[PDB]
């Protein structure tokens, strides 16, 4: 994908996160578990919902054939009528098909972007209090219990509060144990 | 019905149909396509 997240550096998705499109999996002393990100999933639903509505709305006026009859010596205008009417069915079919194809790509790329951005949200909260492992996961340099996890999930992680514990752990790791 | 075609009635909320272009009533918009489907979700794993 254009944003390299879905079926990219995050290889494959989670059958087990059922309550949203994007979210988190965590793992600590008290266990592990999945949790949807409500806010991103909601922005996405808003986007896609609006998109589907805009498509319906723009296709609202659009050519509507009407039947006209012509006698056997009005063949030139019967042909001009057929071609005019076929001409519009063709313009409109192209418009619908191409809009659908073009917007499908954008939609699929929109979600990809949404996962990248969420990953980056967590990345820039944690900074060097966690280590980027490369598969979509962060490994903390400090103990992070369920309360601390939620703080990551909801925008509230206090970096200063853990950084001391973080610097001690990074220290132990560089030194070799 | 609310929408009629020389080949039969249409009973649909959809924005498009491909039945026949000469309709009367409150109809969707005719296209020659066999298939039109929008993505809403995301790319589904392997």
């Amino acid at each position: 994908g254009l944003f390299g997240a879905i079926a990219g550096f995050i290889e494959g998705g989670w059958q087990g996160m059922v309550d949203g499109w994007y979210g988190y999996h965590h793992s600590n002393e008290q266990g592990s578990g999945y949790a949807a990100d409500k806010e991103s999933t909601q922005k996405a639903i808003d986007g896609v919902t609006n998109k589907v509505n805009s498509i319906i709305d723009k296709m609202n006026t659009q050519f509507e054939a009407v039947g006209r009859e012509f006698n056997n010596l009005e063949r030139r205008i019967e042909n001009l009528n057929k071609k005019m009417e076929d001409g519009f069915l063709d313009v409109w079919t192209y418009n619908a098909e191409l809009l659908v194809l073009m917007e499908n790509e954008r939609t699929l790329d929109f979600h990809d972007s949404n996962v990248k951005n969420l990953y980056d949200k967590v990345r820039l909260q944690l900074r060097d209090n966690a280590k980027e492992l490369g598969n979509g996961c962060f490994e903390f340099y400090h103990k992070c219990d369920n309360e601390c996890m939620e703080s990551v999930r909801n925008g509230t992680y206090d970096y200063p509060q853990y950084s001391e514990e973080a610097r001690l752990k990074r220290e132990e790791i560089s030194s070799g144990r | 019905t609310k929408c009629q075609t020389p080949m039969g009635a249409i009973n649909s909320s959809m924005p498009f149909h491909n039945i026949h272009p000469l309709t009367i009533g409150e109809c969707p918009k005719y296209v020659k396509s066999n298939r039109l489907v929008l993505a809403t979700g995301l790319r589904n794993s392997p």
Partner: antibody, heavy 121, light 105 residues
Framework: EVQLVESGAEVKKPGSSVKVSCKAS????????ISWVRQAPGQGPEWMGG????????KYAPKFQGRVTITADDFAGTVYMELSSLRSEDTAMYYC??????????????WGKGTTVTVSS | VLTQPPSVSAAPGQKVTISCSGS????????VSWYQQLPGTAPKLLIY???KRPSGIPDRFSGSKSGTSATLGITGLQTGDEANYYC??????????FGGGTKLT
């Protein structure tokens, strides 16, 4: 700004089915879930279940899991509720109510006026 | 199975309080919203997420979760406030549970 308008009163015999609808203004596709909540004469409200947009998934209450079906016609801006195996204690006012977002949740910020179903023999 | 006192009473101008109570698997973890019902009308959202208050609702209404139970408070109360009040919450199998209600006079 969103108006929820429901279908007319219904009168049913026990052991049959009713199917109420609810039309939401705007859209027609929505980014918020819709639920069905009922209220029996002299009783508090009971939540029946609701449906999530795009995902289409439904969530029902223990009390009804098994005889309620919630469905949507997103192009018409309409959700439906069908309750079968009716009994006289299903005689109640049936409200559709929308949530603030995509999840069905304790918070429903706009309600329909209500529609009555009477279950008598 | 969510506990609420059947009725509460007071005179035009005082501050009443309706409590609401249940186990860890509803109020302890999950949030509470409160609703107002006047005869002939659908319930009406008064407060949500424990203590937020939607537009249209005057700041004489409020609430909180003082433990595994939550309360609503009205102040400067008018004749219009004569109604039924219900707390709602989310209970983990999973459903929206309401309280029994409380007639306010």
């Amino acid at each position: 700004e969103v108006q929820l308008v429901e279908s007319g009163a219904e009168v049913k015999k026990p052991g049959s089915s009713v199917k109420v609808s609810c039309k939401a203004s705007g859209g027609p596709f929505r980014s918020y879930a819709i639920s069905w909540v009922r209220q029996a004469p002299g009783q508090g409200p009971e939540w029946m279940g609701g449906i999530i947009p795009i995902f289409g998934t439904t969530k029902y209450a223990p009390k009804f899991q098994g005889r309620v079906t919630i469905t949507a016609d997103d192009f018409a801006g309409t959700v439906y509720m069908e309750l079968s195996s009716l009994r006289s204690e299903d005689t109640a006012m049936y409200y559709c109510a929308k949530h603030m977002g995509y999840q069905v949740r304790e918070t429903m910020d706009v309600w329909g006026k209500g529609t009555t179903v009477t279950v008598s023999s | 199975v969510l506990t609420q006192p059947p009725s509460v009473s007071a005179a035009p101008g005082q501050k009443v309080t309706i409590s609401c109570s249940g186990s860890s698997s509803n109020i302890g973890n999950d949030y509470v919203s409160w609703y107002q019902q006047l005869p002939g009308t659908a319930p009406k959202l008064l407060i949500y997420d424990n203590n937020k208050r939607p537009s249209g609702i005057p700041d004489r209404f409020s609430g909180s979760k003082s433990g595994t139970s939550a309360t609503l408070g009205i102040t400067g109360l008018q004749t219009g406030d004569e109604a039924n009040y219900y707390c709602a919450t989310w209970d983990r199998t999973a459903y929206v549970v309401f309280g029994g209600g409380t007639k306010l006079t």
